[PDB]
Amino acid sequence: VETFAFQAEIAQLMSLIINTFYSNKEIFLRELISNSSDALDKIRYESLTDPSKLDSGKELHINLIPNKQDRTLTIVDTGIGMTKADLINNLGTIAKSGTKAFMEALQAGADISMIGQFGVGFYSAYLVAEKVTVITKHNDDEQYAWESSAGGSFTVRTDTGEPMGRGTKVILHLKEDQTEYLEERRIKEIVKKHSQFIGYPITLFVEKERDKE
Ligand SMILES: Nc1ncnc2c1ncn2[C@@H]1O[C@H](COP(=O)(O)OP(=O)(O)NP(=O)(O)O)[C@@H](O)[C@H]1O
Ligand SMILES: [Mg+2]
Numbered sequence: 001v002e003t004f005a006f007q008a009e010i011a012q013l014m015s016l017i018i019n020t021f022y023s024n025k026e027i028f029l030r031e032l033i034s035n036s037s038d039a040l041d042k043i044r045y046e047s048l049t050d051p052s053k054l055d056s057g058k059e060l061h062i063n064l065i066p067n068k069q070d071r072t073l074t075i076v077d078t079g080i081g082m083t084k085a086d087l088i089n090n091l092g093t094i095a096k097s098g099t100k101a102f103m104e105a106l107q108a109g110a111d112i113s114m115i116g117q118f119g120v121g122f123y124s125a126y127l128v129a130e131k132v133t134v135i136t137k138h139n140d141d142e143q144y145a146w147e148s149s150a151g152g153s154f155t156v157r158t159d160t161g162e163p164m165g166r167g168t169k170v171i172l173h174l175k176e177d178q179t180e181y182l183e184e185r186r187i188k189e190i191v192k193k194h195s196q197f198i199g200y201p202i203t204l205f206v207e208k209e210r211d212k213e
Contacts, residue, residue, distance in 0.1 A: 073182060087156055
């Protein structure tokens with residue numbers, strides 16, 4: 001297991017999100033679905049000139065999986081996935097130009113929904129999750145797990161769980177006061193409100209239901 005420090009302003013932002021009350025938390029799901037959609041676009045365009053890039057799975061889609069027993073909401077996609085280097089670089093160690101401006105905007109009363117416009121959309125996960133685990137598989141790298149409960153660092157390790165062919169799974173270990181995001185109707189209404197124009201199928205597990213479509 002390897003441990004990495006978040007870039008200082010990203011650590012500051014995470015602390016702010018965790019320790020300051022914001023309403024409109026539901027936008028975390030929009031932000032994670034947008035990341036899945038971007039990752040799906042990436043592999044889709046790569047496959048146009050190299051169809052073998054889909055040998056690890058031709059289906060391009062997003063699954064939403066609430067688990068009441070474990071108190072987790074998982075967002076799974078069959079997108080491009082992240083290499084080990086991608087995880088380390090893109091999910092915490094590299095500065096984002098908009099972080100300080102976003103924190104200033106929040107102090108001045110901006111809605112937390114603006115997070116994506118400032119280039120730090122992923123960190124919305126910490127509005128509702130005490131811990132986030134990201135399991136990811138990119139072509140020509142092994143499967144990896146990134147994890148953080150905030151507090152300034154994250155870990156990366158090779159994953160020995162169930163193999164994914166290709167893509168990313170973001171596992172949200174929800175705070176005890178945010179279990180509404182495990183409910184079928186709640187998830188449906190947030191997807192309808194915020195993610196209605198995503199151009200890939202989105203499936204909800206309750207047994208299994210295509211949204212919606
Ligand atoms: N599901 C995923 N699949 C592949 N890469 C991902 C996924 N989620 C996040 N990433 C990577 O993590 C980076 C940071 O995500 P994020 O903080 O959401 O910023 P962003 O998507 O680049 N810009 P924005 O969300 O519009 O503020 C992305 O740019 C990707 O490189
Ligand atoms: Mg994003």
